[PDB]
Subunit: 195 residues, 4 copies
C-alpha cells in the first residue's frame, strides 16, 4: 500500500505543483490522487477490522473482506496503468468495503439481537449478508448488476441498523426520530425494489 501512497503523492505533485502552470484538466489527476488517498486509508483501517472479523468468528465476512481487499488492490494496480473502467470499478470496490465494515458493525450489534432472539432480524440479516456476497460475486464477474444489487444490500443494512438503534432506545420524543427516518428508508427501499 505504501507504494500506492507514494504513487498518489507523485500524482498530486504532477497535478498541482507542476500542472498549475499547465492543462486545467489536471483536475482529473487531482481526483485520482485524492481517490487513492481515501482508498489507502480505508484499506488500512479494514485490515484491523479483519482481526475484528476473525475474533468475531464469521468466515463469510472474512472471505468478503479478503476478496474485497484483493479487488481494491487489483483496481489500484489497473489504475496505475489506465483503463477508465478502473474508475467505476474502484468506486464500486470502495463502496463494497464500506458496506463490509458496516456489516461488521451490524454483526456486533446483532449480537444484541441474538441475546434478544429477534429471529426476524436474524433471517433478514442473513439475506443481507448473502446479498452482499452476491454483489461481490457479480462485481468479481464484472456484471453491471453489481451496483444494482449492492444498493439493495446497503439499504437493507441501514434498515436493520435503524431497527437495532430503535431497539436500544426502546431499552432506554426521543424515539420519534427513528419512527420518522425508518419511514424514509422504507419507502426509498420500496422505490428501488418496485420502480
Amino acid at each position: 500500500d505504501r507504494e500506492i501512497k507514494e504513487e498518489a503523492r507523485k500524482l498530486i505533485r504532477e497535478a498541482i505543483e507542476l500542472l498549475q502552470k499547465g492543462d486545467p484538466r489536471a483536475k482529473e489527476i487531482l481526483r485520482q490522487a485524492i481517490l487513492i488517498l481515501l482508498a489507502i486509508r480505508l484499506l488500512e483501517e479494514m485490515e484491523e477490522n479483519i482481526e475484528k472479523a476473525e475474533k468475531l468468528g464469521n468466515e463469510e465476512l472474512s472471505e468478503l473482506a479478503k476478496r474485497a481487499i484483493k479487488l481494491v488492490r487489483e483496481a489500484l494496480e489497473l489504475l496505475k496503468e489506465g483503463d477508465p473502467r478502473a474508475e467505476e470499478i474502484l468506486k464500486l470496490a470502495l463502496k463494497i468495503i464500506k458496506a463490509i465494515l458496516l456489516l461488521l458493525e451490524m454483526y456486533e450489534n446483532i449480537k444484541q439481537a441474538e441475546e434478544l432472539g429477534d429471529e426476524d432480524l436474524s433471517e433478514l440479516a442473513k439475506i443481507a449478508i448473502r446479498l452482499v456476497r452476491q454483489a461481490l460475486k457479480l462485481l468479481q464477474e464484472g456484471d453491471p448488476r453489481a451496483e444494482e444489487i449492492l444498493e439493495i444490500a446497503l439499504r437493507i443494512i441501514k434498515l436493520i441498523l435503524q431497527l437495532l438503534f430503535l431497539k436500544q432506545r426502546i431499552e432506554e420524543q426521543f424515539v420519534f426520530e427513528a419512527e420518522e427516518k425508518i419511514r424514509r428508508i422504507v419507502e426509498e427501499l420500496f422505490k428501488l425494489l418496485e420502480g
Copy 2:
C-alpha cells in the same frame, strides 16, 4: 401472525436463495417479504398498545385499533393470494396503524392539556380522531378518499404534537426550532387543504 412470518420467510427464500439464479424481477418478491416483516413487527407492538388504550379507557381508539388490525390481517391474507390492489391496501393499512399508535401517544400527551384545560387542543384533537375514524371507514369501504383524508389526519396530529412539545418547552434558542417547524407544518397543511 407467526404463520404470516413463516410465509414471509418462504417469500424471502424464494426471492433470494432461489431467485439469485433467475429472474431479476425477484425484487418484487423481496419487497413483499420485507413488507410483511415490517407489518408483523408493527402488529406485534400494536397488540400491547391496545392494552395501553384500554387502560387509557377510550373506546373510540380501541375500536380504531381493532378494525385496523383486522384490516391489516385481511390484507395479508389477500396478499398471500395476489390481487395487486393488496399492495396499496397494505401500505394504507400500515400508515393507518402508524397513525393510531401516534394517536395513543398524542392522547397520553393530551392528558397534559386536560390538566391545563387547553380546550382548543381538545376540540382540535376531537376533530383529528374523528377524521382518522372517517379515513378508516372510507378504507373499509375502499373509497380512494381514504388516503386524502388520512393525510390531513396525520398533518393535524403532527401539528397538535408540535404544540404540545412547545407547551412542554414552555414548562421548561430552545423554543426557536419549534417556532420554525410549526411554520413548515402549518404551510404544508394549508397547501394540502387549499391546493
Copy 3:
C-alpha cells in the same frame, strides 16, 4: 377573541361533523378553522408580550404590536363575512405578528449588544425595526409591497439573531454551524435583494 374561538369551533363542526356527509370542498372550511385557532393562540401570547414590550420601554414596538393586533382582529372580522382577500391579509398579519414577537426576543438579546457596544448591530437593527414599520404601514395601506418588504425585514432579523448567537458562543466545532448557516442566510438575503 373568545367569540372568535367559538366561531372557529362552529366552523370546524360544520367542516367535519356535518361536512363529512357532503361536499369534499369542506377542506376550505377546515383550513379556515385551523387558521383561526392558530391566530387566536398567537394573539393570546402576544398580549402578554405587550407587557414585555412596555417593561422593555420601547414605544415603537408597542405601536407595532397594537397596530398588528388590530390588523389581525379586523382580518378576522372580515373573514367572518367572506372576501377571499381576507385569506391573504390574515396570513400576512400573522407573519407580521410573528416578526414582532421575534423582534421583542431580538431586542432583549440586543440588550447584550448594547452592553458590548456593537454599534454595527445597533444601527442594523434600527434599520430592521424601521423596515418592519414600513411593512406594517404598507400592509395597513394594502400595498402588495407589504410582503416584499416584510420578507427582507425577516431576513435581516434572522441574520442579526444569528450574529448574536454567534457572539454568545464566542463568549462560550461548536462555532462551525453558525459559520455555515450565516452564509446560507447571507446568500439568500442577497438573492432576494439583487434578483
Copy 4:
C-alpha cells in the same frame, strides 16, 4: 475600516430612511450596505487571527492573510466608486478570507496530525494551502478561474477537517454521522473535479 463603516451607515440611511419614499431599486443600496457591514466585521476578526498566524509561525498563511486583506480593502474602495465588477470581486475576496480563517483553524487542528504523523493529511493539506495560494494569485490577476480553483480549495479543506474530527472521535452511533457526511463531501468533490 471605521471610515468604511461610516460610509456603510450613510449607504443604509440613503437606502432606507430616504429611499423608502422612492425607487424600489434601493434594495441594491441596502445590499451594498449590509455587504460592507459583514466585510468590516470579517476583517476586524481576521486582523486578530493574523496575530494567531504569527504565533502559529507560518509565513505562507501570513502572506495569504495580508494579501487577502489588501484585496478586500481595495475592493471596498472600488465599490465606493462603482464598477459593478466590484460586487463579484468583493464576494470572492470575502470567500477567500473565510477560507483563510478556516485554514488557520485547520492548521491548529493539524497540529494534532503532526503529533500523530498523519503524513497523508500533511501532504494533502500542503496541496490545499498551495491551491488557496493559487486561487489568491489568480484573483489578484483577475482570472475567472479564481472561483473554480477556490471551490476545490474549500472542498479539500472541508474534507480534511472532516477527517480530523473523525480522528478525534476515534480518540473518543457517534462515528456514523461522519461516515455519512464524508461520503457526500467526497462525491461532491468528485463531481466538481470530474464533471
